[PDB]
């Protein structure tokens, strides 16, 4: 498992009439565990996260412990083919590209 | 409990004498579902994709979580005179990713 | 400093309001 990082997750898009390019739709996901002290490869934590971790270490019990989540995204473009018609679309914020727990 | 939103969480600083005393740092808490019943901005495409995967029948290893998305700085003063400024301390928005 | 310490009177509530953490 290891610490918080990025990992693969892909699906296949299918249509009954048209054909889509590209077929394999790729959208990674963030997964792992981040602890204290930090043993990771991403940038340093913020002040909020270290405050929460210290609170957890003193003996308290929070109702929402820190979670590993992404912090950036990139767009994508799709093309659809069918008789007498080709179409293209551009959709932003689809592919995750970084992870860091908040 | 309700849906994902912001809620109070404060501590007291004690060491000199510090101003201000009550250190305020809110926290995000709640649950976000499908369809959206919230007051924050609309979800992204990634989150709706994950929710649709979860609804179809699959079982993800990291379901969406309610987290903050903004921060503000703060300034502290210590008397015995010193001042410090530290950024990214107070959460001010919530939205699940 | 003395005035600030004097003005910060203790509370009279019967329950702890929150935790205390040193500015370290």
């Amino acid at each position, epitope marked *: 498992d290891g610490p918080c990082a990025l990992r693969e997750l892909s699906v296949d898009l299918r249509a009954e009439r048209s054909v889509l390019i590209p077929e394999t739709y790729q959208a990674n996901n963030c997964q792992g565990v981040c602890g204290w002290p930090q043993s990771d490869r991403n940038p340093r934590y913020g002040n909020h996260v270290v405050l929460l971790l210290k*609170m957890q270490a003193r*003996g*308290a*019990a*929070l*109702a*929402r412990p820190p979670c590993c989540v992404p912090t950036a995204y990139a767009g994508k473009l799709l093309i659809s083919l069918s008789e007498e018609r080709i179409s293209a679309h551009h959709v932003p914020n689809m592919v995750a590209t970084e992870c860091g727990c908040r | *409990d309700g849906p994902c939103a912001l*809620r*109070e*969480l404060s501590v007291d600083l*004690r060491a000199s004498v510090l101003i201000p005393e009550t250190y305020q740092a809110n*926290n995000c*808490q709640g649950v976000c579902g499908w369809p959206q019943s919230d007051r924050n901005p609309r979800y992204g495409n990634h989150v709706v994709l994950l929710l649709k995967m979860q609804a179809r029948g699959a079982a993800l290893a990291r379901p969406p979580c309610c987290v903050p998305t903004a921060y503000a700085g703060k300034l502290l003063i210590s008397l015995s005179i010193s001042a410090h400024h530290v950024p990214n301390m107070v959460a001010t928005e919530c939205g699940c990713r | 400093t003395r005035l600030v310490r004097a003005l910060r009177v*203790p509370p*009279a509530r*019967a*329950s*702890a309001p*929150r*935790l*205390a953490l040193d500015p370290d």
Partner: antibody, heavy 120, light 107 residues
């Protein structure tokens, strides 16, 4: 971690006074108050008082006023309770507690319990 | 002072049923209430603080709700390891610890 340790069972004459102790471990008592609780076999729980080690300001209930004195010492992280003027109605079990409840976090720690008996 | 009344005073289940307990207050107590559990020969242990949250290690079965002047505590599927006495506490003033409710099984 945090651990609360107490003394052993005590038996006293009807008219003497007792001094119970409660010592923390792995924690600094200056962080928050300390509460003393009483329990009788069938009358349910009750509240006696609380102490704030940092300042020394203590609060007692409206029924136990004048026959229970609470004190604290931060040099060794310990608290003492002196119980005076026993009348064969105090045979019970006493507990040392730390409580904090807030909308986003909470901390609850209890002792092991000290038994006090009064007989001749 | 605030006085808390807890009902019912006795209960009996069949190890597969749902259970509900109510704890009414004598004055507006906002949303400061806690639900405990005490097994024989042991010190209490917190289960539910505030009015809805859950302490670490508490399973999903237990739940609680209410506000203002009425609070309820419910268990969905009783098991064989839930024999204890339950108390409801308030914190808006000098603490009060309810009256206590027992529980029993069948066979």
């Amino acid at each position: 971690e945090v651990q609360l340790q107490q003394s052993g069972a005590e038996l006293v004459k009807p008219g003497a006074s007792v001094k119970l102790s409660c010592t923390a471990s792995g924690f600094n008592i200056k962080d928050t108050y300390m509460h003393w609780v009483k329990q009788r076999p069938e009358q349910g729980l009750e509240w006696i008082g609380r102490i704030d080690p940092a300042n020394g300001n203590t609060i007692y209930a409206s029924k136990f006023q004048g026959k229970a004195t609470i004190t604290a010492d931060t040099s060794s992280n310990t608290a003492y309770m002196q119980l005076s003027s026993l009348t064969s109605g105090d045979t019970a079990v006493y507990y040392c507690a730390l409580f904090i409840t807030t909308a986003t976090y909470a901390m609850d720690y209890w002792g092991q319990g000290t038994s006090v008996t009064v007989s001749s | 002072s605030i006085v808390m009344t807890q009902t019912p005073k006795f209960l009996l289940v069949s190890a597969g049923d749902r259970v509900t307990i109510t704890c009414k207050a004598s004055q507006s107590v906002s949303n400061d209430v806690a639900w405990y559990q005490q097994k024989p020969g042991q010190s209490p242990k917190l289960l539910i603080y505030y009015a809805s949250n859950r302490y670490t290690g508490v399973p999903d079965r237990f739940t609680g709700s209410g506000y203002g002047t009425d609070f309820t505590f419910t268990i969905s599927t009783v098991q064989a390891e839930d024999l204890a006495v339950y108390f409801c506490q308030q914190d808006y003033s000098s603490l009060t610890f309810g009256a206590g409710t027992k529980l029993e099984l069948k066979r």
